[model samples]
Target: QQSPLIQTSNADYKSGKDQEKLRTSVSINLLKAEEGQIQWKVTFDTSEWSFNVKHGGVYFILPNGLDLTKIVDNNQHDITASFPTDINDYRNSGQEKYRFFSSKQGLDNENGFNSQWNWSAGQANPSETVNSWKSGNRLSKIYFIDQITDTTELTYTLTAKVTEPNQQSFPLLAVMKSFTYTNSKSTEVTSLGAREITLEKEKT
Candidate 1:
């Protein structure tokens, strides 16, 4: 039998290269494993259609250096990777002078993150989520991408690179996946059994 394919359209993503980047559709499927575990196979018909297999381990990286993992499972809950310890710090944007505007919304009102570890906004916006103003609020997310599958560990470290000057795009590629579980396992069983197909677009 063959695995099913998942078709998804990426949001209009702009990078630092002339702001001419577009999102493409890709297919993904999970492979079965022992001990109630699983793996993923991403495929697409854009430019590339192959990736290295992770023989087996707690660490794995995509062929394109995307650093993918099946341990923590991202795309679940509002997971945070990194943040500056100082408040109202402009170091996150790499600018000497910085404004700390919290939009028209209060800390916990507009951008959910007033608790302990939550993003004010840039966490969701790959283009500018981390480029927002943080008045008296300092916390720039740095190098981290997480895979939130279960809460047993409650929290895990993100494995993605987080660059400063959070605007347009640099080196922060954020991806997420939402899934259901039973007791302490994925309901889909062989949850990850697809491929990742990357499609690039030139800004119009």
Candidate 2:
């Protein structure tokens, strides 16, 4: 089993370009980790890489108060190798509930890819769940992506309306699955995966 306390520092990595600098980073903060409910915030950012990042976003499956040990079983939760069957999937063959958002242009909520969590199995529009899903142990992930350029800054915040700090839950170990990018036509896709970041205990 993974530890209950995980703290990840921001890291910078370059892409395959000399003229255009590319980098990736993330920050995970756990507000409350208790049995009945758990809350955390994950911030992901990509440095401007050649000014050609037409599409970019992050992906992860949130554990919604379920016994992950039982659901995950032996599977390593390797998303890139096998994208888990999320709640939005019509088949509903698995317990994994995944979500992702990408921006067609620069990193900002106005033009970024967005999605929400729906009760039934289907697609979720980002607008439906704006600053939502922070109730109880209803798990969630907040991400931000901006074209890694000389004059661009990206930031995303999801306010939490959590209860008092008397409750306690085990720490949830989540791996930063992938940061994806593609050109204007979506003809080709470049995906970067397996950046480990842990969500530790914190407050709103």
Candidate 3:
């Protein structure tokens, strides 16, 4: 059963009180959206989480095929408020929404991709193969549905093309939001992490 959204300390880190509780962790991958720029490919690992979860996934607005290297990575960004002007919309009421912005002009509302999206398995192109870390042992089986949440650990390995042959970098700002529950409490957590994307080619 699902619990309410509660604000507990990151206490789960030390107390271990939440060891059996529901939790969410996300991973991100970068691919050639095309040529010099890249697109975000995100994933979440929650194999045996006890409760259901609702996630904002990843949201940002940059012109399609825009060169990310042109922008500087200062890590200043914000997501727009929810729609319908109600916080309750995040729950059973309705779906939540967001808008992205940076402090400077043009960067704030340049309009690339401005929608809330989610993650799923088998969505990536079959021909485009990316290396992955070792798979988890949560369920010793391979099936269509199980592969989606096969891992209980959270880690992200990004891949980028090597046109110039060895190393590359791109600017990125991404925010991940998840709403989870427990028998007694519910909580809304937001994680914001950004970096100047970098990739190195493997010697084959």
Candidate 4:
């Protein structure tokens, strides 16, 4: 079903612009994949696109066997000594700096995200023309500070792209699904379902 971004108010989003659709893709490259701590680079394809990205983010879900909780599942021991002081970071008002997630909640204090590997830009205003134009590509790394012993390979879904309003509206004509990466000698390495949808829509 179409989200409220296009379905509800705002005719600007409804105006048929189906001729071209914004495309998104992400990849997880194992930078430090091992039993101890794991890290990887998640790259989002943002090339050949222009739109007021608005405000949005993606969550990096940990595998079932792995977690970033204050206490590790198998071993009931405190992992992070400090709490996620800064709830989330943002692109402060009109200033054009870079940003990632909403808050700094960490060590399972936040939902699913042991680490939030994401990026955002532009002003926070609602006007479509106010935000920064996303071009080329954006990439970030996910870090797991806690250590582990078992070398079990697992699948992690980045989850869906959640916007400030939780909808893709007007200039926000984009849908990004959290991709997955399995760093073991496993089956096919995967991209998010959103990437597939974008390409499939572009084909028509």
Q: Per-candidate TM vs. native?
A: 0.21, 0.31, 0.32, 0.26
Q: By the TM-score metric, which is better: model 1 or model 2?
A: 2
In candidate 2, stretches whose alpha carbon ends up further than 4 angstroms from where it belongs are: 1-24, 49-52, 64-204
TM-score between model 2 and native: 0.31
> lDDT of each prediction vs. the true structure?
0.25, 0.29, 0.27, 0.24
**Model 2 accuracy (lDDT, Cα):** 0.29
CA error at residue 60 for candidate 1, angstroms = 13
- Per-residue lDDT of candidate 2, residues 1-204 (tens digit): 123332231122322342122222334455444443444444434344223334333333343332222121112332322332232344322222333322222223322223322211111111112213323324443222222232233332222322434423322322221224333333122222121123344565
**Candidate 1 ranges beyond 4 A from true positions:** 1-4, 10-25, 42-204
Error of 2 at 53 (Å): 3.7
* Winner by lDDT: 2
lDDT by residue for model 4 (132-200), tens: 212211212122222112222222322222222222221212222212211132311212211111111
Candidate 4: count of backbone clashes, pairs at least 3 residues apart or interchain? 5
lDDT tens readout by residue for model 3, 1-204: 111111111113322454323222434445444544354533434443322333223332222113223211112221111212222223312232332222121211222111121111111110111101001111110000111212243333232332444334433333333344222223333333333345443455
Model 3 has an lDDT value of 0.27
Residue 119, model 3: lDDT of: 18
**Global local distance difference test of model 4:** 0.24
Clashing residue pairs in candidate 2, if any?
33-169, 34-168, 34-169, 35-168, 35-169, 47-148, 48-148, 48-149, 102-113, 115-126
The positional error of residue 38 in candidate 4, measured at the CA in angstroms, is 1.8
Q: Whose lDDT is higher: candidate 3's or candidate 4's?
A: 3
